[PDB]
Amino acid sequence: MPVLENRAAQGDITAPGGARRLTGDQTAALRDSLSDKPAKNIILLIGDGMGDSEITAARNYAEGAGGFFKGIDALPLTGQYTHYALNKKTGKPDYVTDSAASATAWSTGVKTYNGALGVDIHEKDHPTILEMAKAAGLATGNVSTAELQDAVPAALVAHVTSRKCYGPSATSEKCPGNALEKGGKGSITEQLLNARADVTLGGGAKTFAETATAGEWQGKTLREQAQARGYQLVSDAASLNSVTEANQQKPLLGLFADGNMPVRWLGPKATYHGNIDKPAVTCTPNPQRNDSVPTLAQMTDKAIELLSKNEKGFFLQVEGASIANPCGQIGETVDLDEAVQRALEFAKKEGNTLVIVTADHAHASQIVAPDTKAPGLTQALNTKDGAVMVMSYGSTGSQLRIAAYGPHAANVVGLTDQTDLFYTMKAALGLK
Amino acid sequence: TPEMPVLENRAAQGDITAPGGARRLTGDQTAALRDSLSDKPAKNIILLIGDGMGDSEITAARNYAEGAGGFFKGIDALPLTGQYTHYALNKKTGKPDYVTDSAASATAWSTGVKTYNGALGVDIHEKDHPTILEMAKAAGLATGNVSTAELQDAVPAALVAHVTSRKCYGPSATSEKCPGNALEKGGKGSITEQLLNARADVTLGGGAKTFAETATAGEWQGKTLREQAQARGYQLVSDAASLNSVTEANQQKPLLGLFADGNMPVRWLGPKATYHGNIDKPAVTCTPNPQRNDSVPTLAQMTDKAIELLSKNEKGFFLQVEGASIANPCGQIGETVDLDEAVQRALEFAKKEGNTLVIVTADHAHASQIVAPDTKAPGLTQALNTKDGAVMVMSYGTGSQLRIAAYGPHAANVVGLTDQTDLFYTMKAALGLK
């Protein structure tokens, strides 16, 4: 079912027809994109805050208005999904979710309250798509450029009443029911190590320095616990590259930064009337990025290579993290686009892989007219077109894009809910 | 048999607090979507435009009027969806201008050419290009142009007028602001004059005021534009009763309904948003506008009457319907509700007829955002009491790509990423126009 490159503007944008992204009728191409056959594998890519506005701004900046993201914009089947959370006491909708409640929704199929991971409004645990995959004998991967304790990667492996419960310390204080010494399943990091995905790659080494309060590994650091439990620990690109396999006997745990992994691009923070009062900005490469720290795309490719060895199949989630910094935000979308390209390249070759690309919720940034005097923070940027684009941040709940390629991708078209994504993945992989 | 499927119910299917309760799907959609795809000719096209109606506006309106887990039986029911880009051009450089106005965006889908902000039916060199409505008429199709805005406003005007500035409503503004287009200066005339020349079978909306102006040259010099319409054989109507009496509309007796002096009445009233309004003022419940009444047809009623009149043409018809806009949350939400009712009419017709492509989108998105209730925001905000019995806060503090959705023959051409100019080529090809 491969392709639909490319949908850049096809010609001279000032001339009749020159800004078209299509070359002819799409009925055959869309029909050819539809298959009801089993998915052997799923790759779910999440861009933090990546709603339609963020996609557009990053395209305009990095590719030009008429440009095309070869990963993000190349998925043939598209829709919009709703991501409202719940008020914990009343059960009524809360129109603006945080990352934890939204990740819980696609990870478990149950709505919840802001801050919850893997539990419902009654604080009851519900299994995750990753746990279910593993129980069925599928290989599992969990990749992020955030700290691995952050809401999105955490939601696949941890059930806690507050997303703040990173390690033993915070869990004892803020989630006493989940604390290991109080009979609970443990902190986010402890539950991560119990879950034992085949491949886990990201930031967040800091919390692994904490020591367990109880159980078999009481008094040892969580890093020592991982080593004791047979994990392959890697911390840089060379150590990652040399890994030849990852499975339940030798699961891979890559910890590539103390906190979040390095942001792709730097620029100044937006300011009051920054588009008027400050020069237009050209984003710059972050010196902290280097070939010793794997990128999101490199971690995605290595996870695919290790997980694809499982004959039954795999589930892999990849999160492009977001750390009022337009350059930071746009470079994060570029990082995600490269990871999506790796996923699509694999899926097109393998032929039984469903790739889904979406966001937890949208950032508040807006693209505004160049002369805008806005009440919040603004910045002018010099885009690939050699024109100024202005972005405004003006302290969100909108539905936002979800797109897919491969078997069962029809289930993201039209209006859906974020919880439907759980059931789509469940059904595509034939999980019970 | 009414047979390619419309989405009948994508509301949350159960108790939203329970596992699976917030699902909008009941099962796999592959078969449904396969059955949604045809490249047979479109006999008819109905294009519905919600002013400012990006994804945020759809979500806010759904939240308020239907609840978070509710469902717009029109807007949310189209099975094939994508996102399109609507950037304009800088007139002098020809480089993208990332934030369009309504005139440049309407020009893009009506003519397939990008242009500068404020341009109607002309490119950055001020050269005219034909519109989808003009092309439909030349091919023997019936044509309708319906709006709750003034008919001179950018969206309806872009189908029938080629002028260098959208401000050129009548003779007086054209001679001042678009001198090359002014009739007495050798051009094709004001927006209103070009509308009268274009002679769609059905034109319904606001904007009676400009018709009081007199022409400055030509056969009808010194007559008002209303008098000109009357002399050129138009059937003029001004309220619901007179619209209802109309039995036919065609090139001998084209229909021109003028239902307000300016814009037609908004659906709902509420207070303007204010600084720290969500904190400093009570949560708002929108109220009915008493200027709305059964003597003024609604957007849906105009849509239904236009379909009834246009569908008599054996070759087919092209119909555009605009739900107009105008930091008034209640006004903007009610406008989305108005559009949803008109989309329901269009889909009901299309489902039965079987050869009708229905497209629902926006010119460009409004700046409103849905934000946390406790938000202290620097712009204008308002708390609203929604259908769920919970508070939603709106903030007004744009260039984002936005939803386009379709049903019927050739609907596949809205899926994925497209440009607003592709919509011109989609409509052209679907109707077989050359």
From Swiss-Prot, chain A:
The keyword Phosphoprotein applies. It holds the Pfam family Alk_phosphatase. Mg(2+) binds at D48, D150, V152, E319. The active site is at S99 (phosphoserine intermediate). It is found in: Periplasm. One of its GO terms (molecular function) is phosphoprotein phosphatase activity. One of its GO terms (biological process) is protein dephosphorylation. It catalyses: a phosphate monoester + H2O = an alcohol + phosphate. It is an enzyme of class 3 (hydrolase). GO terms for cellular component: outer membrane-bounded periplasmic space; periplasmic space. Belongs to the alkaline phosphatase family. Isozymes 1 and 3 are a dimer of identical chains, isozyme 2 is a dimer of heterogeneous chains, one of each of the subunits from isozymes 1 and 3. PANTHER family: ALKALINE PHOSPHATASE. This is Alkaline phosphatase.
